[PDB]
Design a protein around this ligand. Structure first.
Ligand SMILES: *[C@@H]1O[C@H](CO)[C@@H](O[C@@H]2O[C@H](CO)[C@@H](O[C@@H]3O[C@H](CO)[C@@H](O[C@@H]4O[C@H](CO)[C@@H](O)[C@H](O)[C@H]4NC(C)=O)[C@H](O)[C@H]3NC(C)=O)[C@H](O)[C@H]2NC(C)=O)[C@H](O)[C@H]1NC(C)=O
Ligand SMILES: CCCCCCCCCCCCCCCCCC(=O)OC[C@H](COP(=O)(O)OCCN)OC(=O)CCCCCCCCCCCCCCCCC
Ligand SMILES: CCCCCCCCCCCCCCCCCC(=O)OC[C@H](COP(=O)(O)OCCN)OC(=O)CCCCCCCCCCCCCCCCC
Ligand SMILES: *[C@@H]1O[C@H](CO)[C@@H](O[C@@H]2O[C@H](CO)[C@@H](O)[C@H](O)[C@H]2NC(C)=O)[C@H](O)[C@H]1NC(C)=O
Ligand SMILES: *[C@@H]1O[C@H](CO)[C@@H](O[C@@H]2O[C@H](CO)[C@@H](O)[C@H](O)[C@H]2NC(C)=O)[C@H](O)[C@H]1NC(C)=O
Ligand SMILES: *[C@@H]1O[C@H](CO)[C@@H](O[C@@H]2O[C@H](CO)[C@@H](O)[C@H](O)[C@H]2NC(C)=O)[C@H](O)[C@H]1NC(C)=O
Ligand SMILES: CC(C)CCC[C@@H](C)[C@H]1CC[C@H]2[C@@H]3CC=C4C[C@@H](O)CC[C@]4(C)[C@H]3CC[C@]12C
Ligand SMILES: CC(=O)N[C@@H]1[C@@H](O)[C@H](O)[C@@H](CO)O[C@H]1O
Ligand SMILES: [Ca+2]
Ligand SMILES: [Ca+2]
Lengths: 48, 48, 96, 145, 474, 48, 163
C-alpha cells in the first residue's frame, strides 16, 4: 500500500482491484492492509 | 551458473530436484520472469 | 490437504531476524546487520512467516493463496527450509 | 537430454497418446497467430512511445554517487521529488525490461500478456512519463492479449 | 589471584528476579539487572571524566546482556571492584585495569563512559590475544576450486582477512591455495613474520584470487605440511596449525595425515564457509582427528566471532601447565581504545579452577576465564628518563626483542603507514630501530647486541638527520 | 537400458567454473557402455 | 648551503624563489654535482607520515625522504658540464668556516637542454619491497616459552558433535 497501489481514490482503488484480479501480489496487499497500520494525517477536523 | 555475488537463488538448475522444481514453477507460470532474469544475467547479462 | 499440511509444518515456520539464532531463547537483544554493504544495529525479533500452517484456518488460507498461484514459490521455499518444531529454518533441509 | 524421449518411441502406446495430444492442439495454431499479431501490434505502439524513456533514475544521495530505493524510481519529465538528482540508469531489470528495439519490446509485451510483473512495467512508465495515459496502454493489453 | 578464588566459589544461579545484578553499563544514557548512575568527577591523567567509586562494564553489541552466561559473569566479577581500588590506593599513578572475559564483556576501572557503530570486542584485542595463547605458526589453506565461486569466495576472502587480524609480530603465517594443484598465493613461499607490512601483502593477494578447477585435498595438504617443516627460515617454534577454508567435500585424505603428523603434532582447524548442502563429514572428521576444531561461517555476521574462537583450543596446553604458565607479558606500543595515547599493556591469564581441591571436574577447566591487563602509558616511561641534563643531541631509547622501539624521539602518536592510500587505527605502532633513524653498519651490530641482551659501549662517527627533514650532518 | 541412462542423467550434479563432484566423475565412465549399446541397436536396424 | 638550498641569486628571478632546492630549478647542474661527488645523498622512509588519498579525509603512508650534504673534504671544484651539443664549464669554491658553497656556471639559455627535475621533498611511495625483505630478514629473538601438545589434553570435543 504505497503511492502506486492504494485505496485513496476511486480510480486508484479500481486499479488495485484490477491488479488483484490479474493476481499480481494480492496476498501482499491483503497483508499490507491488515492489522494496526498507521493512519493518514487528516489535514482538517482538528483534535486534541 | 546461478551463484552470484549475493548468493544463489532457490530456483536454480544445479541438482535434478532443483531443476525439476524450477521447471515446474515456470510451467505454472508464477514468477517465471524472475527466473528468466537470472538465466539472462548468467549467460553474460543483457549484452550477450 | 489442510489437515495433512498442518501436521507437516505446524510451528515450524518461525525464524529469527538474524540467521545465527535458532530458537526463541537466543533470539533476543541487538545485532549488527550487514545487508546492502552497510552496517546497522537492529533488534532481534522472533517472527513467524506471513503465511503458515499453525492451525487449520491458516493452513486453509495458505492453500487458497497457493491455489490462486500467488507467492507459492516462497511458501515452498519456507516449507523446504523447515527443520523442527521450534527451530529456525535451515536452507534446503527437507527437499522432499 | 533427448535420451528420455526414446521411451516414447519404445512404447507405441505413448506414441498414440502423444499423437492424440498433438492432434488436439492443431486448431489452436490459428489462435497463436492471432496472439502474435497482438504482440506485434502493442510492441510497435510501445516502441513509438516508451523507447529510451526508461534510462534515468533518482540516484543523488550524497553518499557515494550511488544508493536509492530498492524498487528504483526512474526519472522523467518532472524530476525527483526530493534531494535526489536524475542520473543515467542501466534499466529496470538490469536493462532487460524496456522498449529500446523491437526485440526488447516484444519480450516485454509477451511478459505482460502473461500477467507476470506487468504492474512493475506500468509503474516504471508512470513516474517516467506521468500517469495520465499509461493506463490506456496496459489495461487493454491485458484485456485483449 | 583474587579472580581465580572468587570465581571458584560461584553457585551458578539460573534466575535473577529477586537478587538483581547491580552494575554500571558503559555506552548507555532489561530484566535481571539494575543500572548505576555515577557521579563522574573530572580527574587528570585521563582525557575524559572518570569515577573511582566503581568499575564500568562493556558488553559488545552482538552479545545480549541479561542472559544466563553474562549475568553469572556479572556477579562473580563484582568482587573485582574492591581489588581494583586496592591497586589504585597503593599506586595512585595507575592507568586502566581491565579484565577481559572469555564471555565477551570487559570490566575496567575507573568507570568512564564508552567512546557510528561499535564493533569493539575484548577477545580480539592484541593484549587479550597475546595472553590467551602462545605464538603460533599458522598456515592458511584456501580452497579455490570452482564450487566456491560466488558468495563463498567473497566470504572466504573476508574470513581470511579477519583471521590475519588475530596474528602479531611473534606469530608466523603464510596463505596457500589449491585447486588440483597447491601453490602459494603471494611472493613469499615460506612463513613470514606477520607484521604490519607483511600482512598487507597477504591481504592483497588473497583479495585477487579466482575460483576454478577441481579440489584435491591430498595435494593441498602435502603442500601445507611441507611448509611447516622448512626450518631454513626464522619461525616461532611453537603451535603449528593448518587452517582449511573450504565449503565441503567427500575426501577424508586419510593417507596424508597418517603420513605427516602420525604423532599429531600439528593441529588442523577446518572452516565451512557459505550457504551450501555439501557433505561436511570429511571436514568435521579431519578437524578433530588432529586435535583441532570445526567452525561454520554461513554469513558475514558469523565471520567475526568464528575467526577468533580458535584460541580456546590453543589455550588448553597453557592451562594444564598450571602456575608455570602465568607470566606477565607486555604488548607492542599501540593507541588506547579509550583515547589515552600510546600505551603498553601487561597481561596475565585467569584459569577456571572450580573443584580443583578434589580434582574431579577437569571438563571445562582447560579453558581460561579471561585475561587481566593493566595499561602503562609511554609518558610514564618518559618521566623515568629525564633529558634536560644533557644537550639536545642526547636522548634515550629502548628496544623490543623484535627490534621495535618502546621509546624514541622519532616515535609519534600516529599509526605507521603501509602502502599508498587508495580510496573509492587498530594496528599497533611498531616502528623498528633501524627505521627510527638513519641505518648504518654499526647500528645493525649495536641493535643486534641489544636484542639478545648484553651491556656495552661504542663510540663512532655517524651522519645524523636534523629535526627538519632537510639536512644531514656528521 | 534407456531407463538406466535416464537414472544416470538424473544423478548428475553441475558445479561452476569446471568443477566435478567425485560421484559425477564415476558416472562419466558409464557413457561409453550406453553409446556402444545404442550403436549396436542402431546397426541392427540400419543394415538388417 | 649544506643541502643545496638557494640562499643567493644573480638573475633576480631566482631571488623571488629564495630558500628553494637547487635541483628543483637547475636539474642539469644539480644532477652533475651529485655525480662528481660533491653532494652525497642517502634516502630514507618515513612510516609515520600523513598522505593525501589517491584514486582507487587523510591516511598515513610511507613517504620517501632524501637529504644532501658535502661528501669530500676537497675545497675547490672545477669541471665542464655536458648536456648535449653544448658545453658549460663551472668552478666551485666552498666558503671557509661556513656550510656554504659558491658555484658559477654559464646561463641555462646558452645550452638548449632541459633535463628532468631532481626534487628533494616528501614524496609518497610504497617501498621497500617486502617480497625480498623476507629473504634476508632482520635479526630478532622470540619468546623461549612454548605451551603445546600436553598429554593430559582432552581434545574430545570437536566442533561437529557439539553442533
Ligand atoms: C568452571 O568450571 C566449572 C566446572 O568445571 C563450570 O561449572 C559448570 O557450569 C555449567 C554451566 O555452563 C553447569 O552446567 C549444568 O549442566 C547443564 C549444562 O548443559 C545444564 O542443563 C541444561 O543443559 C542444556 C544443554 O546441555 C542447556 O541448554 C540448558 O541451558 C541447561 N539448563 C537448564 C535446562 O536449566 C544445567 O542446568 C547446568 N547446571 C545448572 C545449575 O544450571 C555445570 O553443572 C557446572 N559445573 C560445576 C561443577 O559447577 C564453570 O562454568 C566454569 N567457569 C565458567 C566461568 O564457566
Ligand atoms: C469490463 C468492465 C470492468 C473493467 C474494470 C477495469 C478497471 C481498471 C480501469 C481503470 C484504471 C484507471 C487508472 C487510474 C490511475 O491510477 O491513473 C492515474 C490517472 C490520473 O493521474 P494524475 O491525476 O495525472 O496523477 C496523479 C498523481 N499520483 O488516472 C486517469 O487518468 C484515469 C481516467 C479514467 C477515465
Ligand atoms: C488484434 C490486436 C488489436 C490491437 C489493438 C490495439 C488498440 C489499443 C492500442 C492503443 C494504445 C494507446 C496508448 C497510448 C499510451 C501513451 C503513453 C504515454 O505516456 O504517452 C504520452 C505522450 C505525451 O508525452 P509525455 O508523457 O508528455 O512525455 C513525452 C514528451 N515529453 O502521448 C500522449 O499523450 C498519448 C495520447 C494518447 C491518446 C489516446 C490514444 C488512443
Ligand atoms: C552472587 O549473587 C548473590 C546474590 O546477589 C550474592 O549472594 C549474596 O551475597 C551477600 C553478600 O555476601 C549476602 O549478604 C547475601 O546473603 C547473599 N545471598 C543473597 C543476596 O541471596 C553472591 O555473593 C554473588 N557472588 C559473588 C561471587 O559475589
Ligand atoms: C632448505 O630446506 C630444504 C627442504 O625444504 C632442504 O634442501 C636441501 O638442499 C640441500 C642442497 O641442495 C640438500 O641437502 C638437499 O637437496 C635438500 N635436503 C636436505 C635434507 O638437505 C634443506 O633442508 C634446506 N636447504 C639448504 C640447507 O640448503
Ligand atoms: C648515507 O650516505 C653514505 C655516505 O654518502 C652512504 O654510505 C655508503 O656505503 C658505505 C658506508 O659508509 C660507504 O663506504 C660508501 O661510500 C657510501 N656510498 C655508496 C654509494 O656506497 C649511503 O648513501 C648512506 N648510508 C646508508 C644508507 O646506510
Ligand atoms: C513432473 C512433475 C509433475 C513433478 C514430479 C515429481 C518428481 C519428478 C520430483 C518432484 C519432487 C522431487 C524430489 C524433491 C527432493 C528430493 C530430496 C532429495 O534429497 C532426493 C531427491 C528428491 C526425493 C526429489 C526427486 C524427484 C521428485 C520426486
Ligand atoms: C596480483 C598481480 O600482481 N596481478 C594480478 C594477476 O596475477 C591476476 O591474474 C589478475 C586477475 O584478473 O589480477 C591482477
Ligand atoms: Ca503471478
Ligand atoms: Ca570443489
Amino acid at each position: 500500500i504505497n503511492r502506486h497501489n492504494n485505496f485513496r481514490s476511486f480510480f486508484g482503488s479500481l486499479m488495485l482491484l484490477f491488479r488483484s484480479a490479474t493476481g499480481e501480489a494480492w496476498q501482499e496487499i491483503m497483508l499490507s492492509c491488515l492489522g494496526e497500520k498507521g493512519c493518514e494525517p487528516d489535514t482538517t477536523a482538528p483534535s486534541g | 551458473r546461478f551463484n552470484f555475488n549475493d548468493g544463489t537463488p532457490s530456483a536454480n538448475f544445479d541438482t535434478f530436484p532443483a531443476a525439476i522444481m524450477t521447471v515446474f514453477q515456470i510451467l505454472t507460470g508464477e514468477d517465471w520472469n524472475e527466473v528468466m532474469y537470472n538465466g539472462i544475467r548468467s549467460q553474460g547479462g543483457v549484452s550477450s | 490437504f489442510a489437515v495433512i499440511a498442518v501436521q507437516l509444518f505446524k510451528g515450524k515456520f518461525f525464524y529469527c531476524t538474524d540467521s545465527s539464532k535458532d530458537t526463541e531463547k537466543e533470539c533476543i537483544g541487538n545485532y549488527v546487520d550487514h545487508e546492502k554493504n552497510k552496517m546497522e544495529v537492529k533488534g532481534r525479533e522472533w517472527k513467524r512467516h506471513e503465511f503458515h500452517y499453525d492451525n487449520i484456518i491458516w493452513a486453509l488460507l495458505t492453500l487458497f493463496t497457493v491455489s490462486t498461484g500467488e507467492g507459492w514459490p516462497q511458501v515452498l521455499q519456507h516449507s523446504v527450509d523447515v527443520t523442527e518444531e521450534d527451530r529456525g529454518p535451515s536452507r534446503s533441509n527437507r527437499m522432499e | 537430454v533427448l535420451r528420455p524421449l526414446k521411451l516414447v518411441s519404445g512404447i507405441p502406446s505413448l506414441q498414440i497418446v502423444l499423437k492424440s495430444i498433438m492432434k488436439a492442439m492443431v486448431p489452436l495454431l490459428q489462435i497463436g497467430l492471432l496472439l502474435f499479431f497482438a504482440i506485434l501490434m502493442f510492441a510497435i505502439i510501445g516502441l513509438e512511445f516508451y523507447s529510451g524513456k526508461l534510462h534515468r533514475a533518482c540516484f543523488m544521495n550524497n553518499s557515494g554517487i550511488l544508493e536509492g530505493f530498492d524498487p528504483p524510481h526512474p526519472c522523467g519529465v518532472q524530476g525527483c521529488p526530493a534531494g535526489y538528482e536524475c542520473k543515467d540508469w542501466i534499466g529496470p531489470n538490469d536493462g532487460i525490461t524496456q522498449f529500446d528495439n523491437i526485440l526488447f519490446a516484444v519480450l516485454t509485451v509477451f511478459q505482460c500478456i502473461t500477467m507476470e510483473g506487468w504492474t512493475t512495467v506500468l509503474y516504471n512508465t508512470n513516474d517516467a512519463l506521468g500517469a495520465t495515459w499509461n493506463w490506456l496502454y496496459f489495461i487493454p493489453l491485458i484485456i485483449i492479449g | 589471584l583474587e579472580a581465580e578464588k572468587v570465581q571458584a566459589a560461584h553457585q551458578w544461579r539460573e534466575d535473577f528476579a529477586s537478587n538483581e545484578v547491580v552494575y554500571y553499563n558503559a555506552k548507555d544514557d532489561e530484566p535481571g539487572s539494575q543500572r548505576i548512575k555515577p557521579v563522574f568527577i573530572e580527574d587528570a591523567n585521563f582525557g575524559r571524566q572518570i569515577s573511582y567509586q566503581h568499575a564500568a562494564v562493556h558488553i559488545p553489541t552482538d552479545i545480549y546482556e541479561g542472559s544466563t552466561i553474562v549475568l553469572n559473569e556479572l556477579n562473580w566479577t563484582s568482587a573485582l571492584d574492591e581489588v581494583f581500588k586496592k591497586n589504585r590506593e597503593e599506586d595512585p599513578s595507575l592507568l586502566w585495569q581491565v579484565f577481559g572475559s572469555a564471555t565477551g564483556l570487559a570490566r575496567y576501572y575507573p568507570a568512564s563512559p564508552w567512546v557510528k557503530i561499535d564493533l569493539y570486542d575484548v577477545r580480539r584485542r592484541p593484549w587479550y590475544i597475546q595472553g590467551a595463547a602462545s605464538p603460533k605458526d599458522m598456515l592458511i589453506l584456501v580452497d579455490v576450486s570452482g564450487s566456491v565461486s560466488g558468495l563463498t569466495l567473497k566470504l572466504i576472502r573476508t574470513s581470511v582477512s579477519e583471521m590475519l587480524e588475530t596474528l602479531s609480530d611473534d606469530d608466523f603465517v603464510n596463505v596457500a591455495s589449491f585447486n588440483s594443484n597447491a601453490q602459494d598465493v603471494s611472493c613469499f613461499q615460506h612463513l613470514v613474520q606477520a607484521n604490519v607490512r607483511n600482512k598487507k601483502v597477504l591481504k592483497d593477494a588473497v583479495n585477487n584470487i579466482t575460483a576454478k578447477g577441481i579440489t584435491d585435498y591430498k595435494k593441498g595438504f602435502s603442500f601445507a605440511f611441507e611448509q611447516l617443516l622448512n626450518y631454513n627460515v626464522s619461525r616461532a617454534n611453537c603451535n603449528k596449525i593448518i587452517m582449511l577454508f573450504t565449503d565441503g567435500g567427500e575426501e577424508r585424505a586419510q593417507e596424508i595425515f597418517n603420513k605427516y603428523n602420525k604423532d599429531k603434532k600439528v593441529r588442523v582447524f577446518t572452516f565451512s564457509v557459505g550457504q551450501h548442502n555439501y557433505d561436511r563429514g570429511p571436514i568435521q572428521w579431519m578437524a578433530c582427528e588432529n586435535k583441532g576444531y570445526y567452525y561454520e561461517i554461513p554469513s558475514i555476521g558469523a565471520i567475526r566471532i568464528n575467526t577468533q574462537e580458535y584460541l580456546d583450543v590453543l589455550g588448553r596446553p597453557m592451562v594444564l601447565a598450571g602456575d608455570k604458565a602465568k607470566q606477565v607479558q607486555w604488548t607492542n606500543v599501540y593507541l588506547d581504545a579509550l583515547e589515552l595515547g600510546l600505551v603498553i599493556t601487561g597481561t596475565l591469564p585467569v584459569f577456571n579452577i572450580t573443584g580443583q581441591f578434589e580434582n574431579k571436574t577437569n571438563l571445562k577447566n582447560q579453558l581460561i576465564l579471561g585475561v587481566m591487563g593493566v595499561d602503562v602509558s609511554l609518558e610514564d616511561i618518559k618521566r623515568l628518563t629525564p633529558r634536560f641534563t644533557l644537550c639536545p643531541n642526547g636522548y634515550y631509547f629502548a628496544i623490543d626483542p623484535n627490534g621495535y622501539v618502546l621509546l624514541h624521539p622519532n616515535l609519534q602518536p600516529k599509526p605507521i603507514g603501509v602502502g599508498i592510500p587508495t580510496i573509492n587505527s587498530q594496528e599497533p605502532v611498531t616502528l623498528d630501530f633501524l627505521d627510527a633513524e638513519l641505518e648504518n653498519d654499526i647500528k645493525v651490530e649495536i641493535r643486534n647486541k641489544m636484542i639478545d641482551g648484553e651491556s656495552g659501549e661504542k663510540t663512532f662517527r655517524t651522519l645524523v638527520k636534523s629535526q627538519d627533514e632537510r639536512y644531514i650532518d656528521k | 537400458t534407456i531407463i538406466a541412462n535416464c537414472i544416470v542423467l538424473a544423478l548428475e550434479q553441475h558445479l561452476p567454473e569446471d568443477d566435478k563432484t567425485p560421484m559425477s566423475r564415476r558416472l562419466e565412465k558409464t557413457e561409453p557402455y550406453f553409446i556402444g549399446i545404442f550403436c549396436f541397436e542402431a546397426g541392427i536396424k540400419i543394415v538388417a | 648551503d649544506d643541502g643545496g638550498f638557494l640562499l643567493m641569486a644573480n638573475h633576480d628571478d631566482y631571488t623571488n624563489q629564495i630558500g628553494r632546492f637547487f635541483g628543483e630549478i637547475d636539474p642539469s647542474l644539480m644532477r652533475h654535482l651529485v655525480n662528481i661527488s660533491v653532494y652525497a645523498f642517502n634516502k630514507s622512509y618515513d612510516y609515520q607520515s600523513v598522505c593525501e588519498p589517491g584514486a582507487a579525509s587523510k591516511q598515513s603512508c610511507i613517504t620517501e625522504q632524501t637529504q644532501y650534504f658535502f661528501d669530500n673534504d676537497s675545497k675547490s671544484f672545477s669541471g665542464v658540464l655536458d648536456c648535449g651539443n653544448c658545453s658549460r664549464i663551472f668552478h666551485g669554491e666552498k666558503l671557509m668556516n661556513t656550510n656554504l658553497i659558491f658555484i658559477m656556471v654559464e646561463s641555462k639559455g646558452t645550452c638548449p637542454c632541459d633535463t628532468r627535475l631532481l626534487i628533494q621533498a616528501e614524496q609518497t611511495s610504497d617501498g621497500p619491497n617486502p617480497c625480498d625483505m623476507v629473504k634476508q630478514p632482520r635479526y630478532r629473538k622470540g619468546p623461549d616459552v612454548c605451551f603445546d601438545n600436553n598429554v593430559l589434553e582432552d581434545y574430545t570435543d570437536c566442533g561437529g558433535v557439539s553442533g
